[PDB]
Backbone as a ProteinNet text record, in pm:
[ID]
protein_1_A
[PRIMARY]
GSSGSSGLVQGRRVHIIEDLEDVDVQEGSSATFRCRISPANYEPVHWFLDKTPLHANELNEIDAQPGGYHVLTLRQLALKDSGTIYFEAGDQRASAALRVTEKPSVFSRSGPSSG
[TERTIARY]
3567.7	3626.5	3595.2	3466.7	3423.7	3458.3	3424.6	3452.4	3323	3336.6	3220.1	3250.3	3150.3	3166.9	3061.7	3075.1	2981.6	2940.4	2829.2	2780.9	2673.5	2676.8	2579.1	2520.8	2426.1	2362.1	2211	2137.1	1991.4	1932.2	1804.5	1738.3	1646.4	1518.7	1420.2	1459.1	1373	1398.5	1267.8	1261.1	1141.9	1164.8	1065	1074.3	953	977.1	869.9	805.1	694.8	623.2	557.5	462	391.6	399.5	510.2	530.3	412	393.6	284.1	284	178.6	166.5	164.9	51.7	37.1	-102.8	-118.4	-247.1	-262.3	-384.3	-412.2	-558.7	-583.5	-719.1	-720.1	-836.9	-851.2	-816.7	-739.6	-699.4	-820.9	-802.5	-911.4	-980.5	-951.8	-1012.2	-927	-968.2	-895.9	-820	-689.5	-605.5	-559.7	-596.7	-559.7	-422.2	-338.9	-204.5	-177.5	-212	-191.6	-48.8	2.1	137.6	157.6	202.6	225.9	372.1	397.1	532.7	539.6	636.7	654.1	746.8	730	629	487.1	391.9	252.2	207.1	268.6	234.6	341.7	389.6	492.5	430.2	491.2	441.8	527.1	521.5	438.7	491.8	419.1	459.1	467.3	562.3	580.7	535.2	496.4	450.4	495.1	565.1	613.8	568.2	572.7	531.9	625.4	710.9	805.5	909.8	871.4	961.4	883.4	782	699.6	639.9	650.1	597.5	445.2	389.2	244.3	202.2	100.4	50.3	-102.2	-159.5	-304.5	-367.6	-480.8	-551.1	-693.6	-760	-896.9	-907.7	-797.5	-794.4	-708.6	-592.5	-501.3	-555.7	-563.7	-614	-511.2	-480.6	-383.9	-437.3	-495.4	-550.4	-440.8	-479.8	-384.9	-450	-485.4	-548.7	-466	-530.2	-464.6	-363.5	-243.1	-139.4	-41	-10.9	82.1	34.8	-96.5	-154.6	-183.2	-84.9	-99.4	-164.5	-288	-361.3	-361	-329.7	-326	-426.4	-528.7	-631.5	-618	-529.1	-506.6	-628.5	-717.5	-838.4	-805.6	-880.7	-859.4	-716.4	-685.4	-552	-540.2	-422.2	-398	-306.3	-318.2	-236.3	-88	-52.9	85.6	127.6	32.4	59.5	114	80.1	125.1	276.3	318.7	460.6	488.8	535	566.4	568.9	476.1	467.8	592.2	661.5	782.5	758.9	705	677.3	806.8	800.1	916.9	883.3	972.6	952.6	1082.1	1153.3	1278.2	1390.8	1437.9	1546.2	1496.4	1365.7	1305.5	1233.3	1207.6	1139.2	1068.4	935.7	856.2	849.3	798.2	786.4	675.3	570.2	457.3	431.8	400.7	373.8	242.3	251.8	133.6	92.3	-0.7	-49	-177.7	-190.1	-308.3	-339.4	-449.5	-490.5	-586.6	-640.2	-733.7	-866.8	-944.9	-1074.7	-1183.7	-1309.7	-1425.3	-1451.8	-1437.3	-1459.9	-1346.1	-1343.9	-1240.4	-1222.1	-1119.5	-1090.9	-1081.2	-964.8	-942.6	-819.6	-701.8	-576.6	-496.6	-522.9	-453.6	-342.7	-377.5	-279.8	-321.6	-316.4	-353.9	-254	-125.4	-19.9	71.3	48.3	128.1	271.5	364.2	503.8	578.8
264.7	154.8	19.9	-12.5	-139.7	-147.5	-260	-280.3	-284.2	-283.4	-286.7	-236.9	-242.1	-197.7	-93.2	-35.6	66.1	39.8	100	81.9	182.1	228.8	326	282.9	189.6	140	130	166.8	162	183.8	149.9	166.4	286.8	264.3	371.8	480.5	580.7	690.9	745.5	755.4	806.1	946.9	1033.1	1170.9	1207.4	1234.9	1271.2	1403.1	1394	1512.6	1585	1518.2	1576.2	1484.3	1493.1	1410.9	1423.5	1322.5	1322.4	1450.6	1469.6	1588.1	1550	1497.6	1456.9	1402	1332.3	1274.5	1265.9	1287.8	1282.4	1247.8	1123.9	1078.2	972.4	951	852.6	712.7	639.2	503.8	419	328.4	242.4	293.8	418.5	479.6	454.1	512.3	495.9	623.2	622.5	737.7	735.7	839.3	849.4	913.2	852.7	903.7	916.5	1031.9	1056.8	1103.4	1070.4	1108.7	1094.5	1202.2	1201.8	1172.1	1055.3	1015	965.6	1016.9	978.2	857.6	780.4	808.8	785.4	859.9	847.1	701.5	623.5	482.4	394.1	434.8	359.5	250.9	132.9	20.8	-103.6	-197.5	-183.2	-76.1	-52.7	47.2	-13.6	34.6	-14.8	88.9	41.8	130.5	79.7	164.8	128.2	229.6	189.4	276.6	261.4	361	358.9	249.3	125.8	12	-115.8	-104.4	-218.9	-201.4	-306.8	-305.5	-305.1	-262.3	-257	-316.8	-402.1	-466	-466.5	-443.3	-441.4	-567.2	-550	-662.1	-622.8	-709.3	-683.7	-548	-503.6	-375.4	-274.5	-319.3	-232.9	-203.5	-75.3	-33.9	52	14.1	87.5	112.6	230.3	266.7	318.6	356.6	408.1	512.8	626.7	734.7	771.9	838.8	881.5	993.3	975.8	1076.1	1040.4	911.5	866.8	899.7	910	941.7	814.7	771.2	650.9	683.5	637.8	662	538.3	558.2	448.1	470.5	385.8	396.3	284.5	304	204.9	193.1	100	78.6	9.9	44.1	-14.2	9.1	133.9	169.5	149.9	178.5	164.3	274.8	305.9	409.8	383.8	256.9	218.4	253.5	248.3	279.8	421.7	507.3	645.9	653.7	698.5	709.8	799.8	740.1	815.5	724.8	747.8	668.2	686.7	576.6	580.6	515.4	593	543	509.6	410.8	369.1	358.1	409	404.8	435.8	331	349.1	394.8	517.2	572.6	688.9	692.5	798.6	741	826	783.4	901	893.9	999.6	982.6	1084.5	1081.1	1173.9	1115.4	1192.9	1163.5	1268	1253.4	1179.8	1050.7	969	976.3	1066.3	1083.3	1004.4	944.7	866.4	875.5	942.4	958.6	848.1	860	760.9	767.2	660.1	653.3	612.4	641.9	609	458.8	392.2	248.3	171.7	40.4	-44.4	-172	-249.3	-374	-351	-305.3	-278.7	-353.5	-303.6	-365.5	-413.3	-536.3	-593.7	-688.2	-781.2	-876.3	-938.8	-859.4	-905.5	-1005.6	-975	-1062.3	-1108	-1229.7	-1285.3	-1310.7	-1230	-1245.2	-1113.5
-79.6	-5.2	-66.8	-75.8	-132.5	-280.9	-343.1	-484.9	-565.7	-698	-784.4	-924.4	-1011.8	-1149.7	-1186	-1305	-1351.7	-1496.2	-1537.4	-1672.9	-1710.1	-1834.4	-1882.3	-2016.5	-2012.2	-2133.3	-2115.5	-2219.7	-2215.5	-2354.3	-2369.7	-2497.7	-2500.2	-2471	-2470.4	-2370.6	-2356.4	-2264.5	-2207.6	-2075.1	-2008.3	-1954.4	-1971.4	-1924.4	-1839.3	-1711.5	-1619.7	-1660.4	-1734.1	-1779.2	-1662	-1597.9	-1484.3	-1362.7	-1289.8	-1171.1	-1075.5	-991.1	-894.7	-812.1	-733.3	-649.2	-501.5	-455.8	-316.5	-290.4	-178.2	-141.5	10	57.9	200.9	226.4	267.3	295.2	404.9	464.6	571.2	521	600.5	564.1	527.5	432	389.3	264.5	228.3	110.5	-13.5	-125.7	-251.3	-287.5	-263.1	-293.2	-438.6	-513.3	-653.9	-670.1	-754.2	-778.5	-928.2	-984.3	-1126.5	-1153.7	-1271.8	-1310.1	-1460.6	-1524.2	-1668.1	-1699.6	-1757.8	-1793	-1937.2	-2012.1	-2151.6	-2163.4	-2271.8	-2374.2	-2323.4	-2378.8	-2339.4	-2343.6	-2432	-2446	-2382.8	-2265.8	-2194.9	-2107.7	-2108.7	-2029.7	-2052.4	-1956.7	-1836.6	-1742	-1633.1	-1534.7	-1395	-1315.6	-1179.7	-1077.5	-959.5	-853.3	-716.7	-642.3	-509.8	-405.3	-278.8	-169.2	-49.7	-29.1	81.8	62.2	92.5	78.3	48.9	-36.4	-72.9	-212.2	-294.6	-431.4	-434.9	-547.6	-563.8	-697.7	-694.5	-815.7	-817.7	-935.4	-950.8	-892	-824.6	-763.5	-725.5	-649.5	-606.4	-537.3	-478	-408.4	-484	-530.5	-604.7	-744.2	-778.1	-908.7	-981.7	-1105.4	-1186.1	-1326.6	-1347.1	-1477.2	-1569.9	-1691.1	-1789.1	-1878.8	-1820	-1894.8	-2017.3	-2114.2	-2238	-2214.4	-2268.2	-2251.8	-2142.2	-2129.5	-2027.6	-1887.4	-1870.4	-1740.5	-1661	-1582.8	-1501.6	-1367.5	-1349.5	-1225.9	-1136.7	-1009.1	-913.3	-800.7	-795.6	-692.9	-590.1	-493.4	-388.9	-297.9	-330.8	-252.1	-119.8	-15.7	116.2	163.7	197.2	244.1	395	448.8	591.9	643.3	771.9	833.4	809.3	791.4	767	624.7	532.4	392.7	378.5	474.4	472.4	453.9	336.1	307.7	188.9	79.4	-41.2	-163.7	-255.8	-377.6	-463.9	-491.1	-572.4	-708.3	-801.9	-936	-1009.4	-1098.1	-1174.8	-1323.2	-1407.5	-1551.8	-1626.1	-1666.4	-1738	-1647.3	-1668.8	-1588.4	-1503.1	-1479.3	-1399.3	-1278	-1179.1	-1057.6	-991.2	-985.2	-924.1	-772.7	-704.4	-559.1	-511.3	-454.9	-404.8	-257.4	-181.3	-38.8	-14.9	14.4	39.4	186	216.3	352.9	375.2	493.3	527.2	676.3	709.2	848.1	890.3	1011.3	1063.5	989	999.6	933.5	1031.9	996.4	1080.2	1086.1	972.1	964.3	1031	1010.4	1068.3	986.9	1021.5	951.6	801	756.2	614.5	563.8	599.8	557.9	678.7	721.7	836.4	791.3	702.7	652.9	521.4	413.4	279.4	222.5	236.9	186.6	300	348.1	456.9	411.5	462.3	425.9	427.6
[MASK]
+++++++++++++++++++++++++++++++++++++++++++++++++++++++++++++++++++++++++++++++++++++++++++++++++++++++++++++++++++

């Protein structure tokens, strides 16, 4: 019905070698999200969760193990974070079940980024 255009152009090529698996831990902890994506030396890398972008910070951790092993240690998580990690790399997109239950502690992720 609507209008629009199409296009099929690109340079490099990414291949999801070992897509994520899954994670389930009490909110506020550091959930690790490993994923093997080629080229092993691909970068930069993007990381999303449900419907929100993710960037390395005092809490956000994004390592780069050898062999395209991108590890994401989201420190200080929240029950709301519980969703699905949507990794991005070229023309590929991973998807891992990001589960997050309640935790014993309190006051972790209430309002880090106002907006």
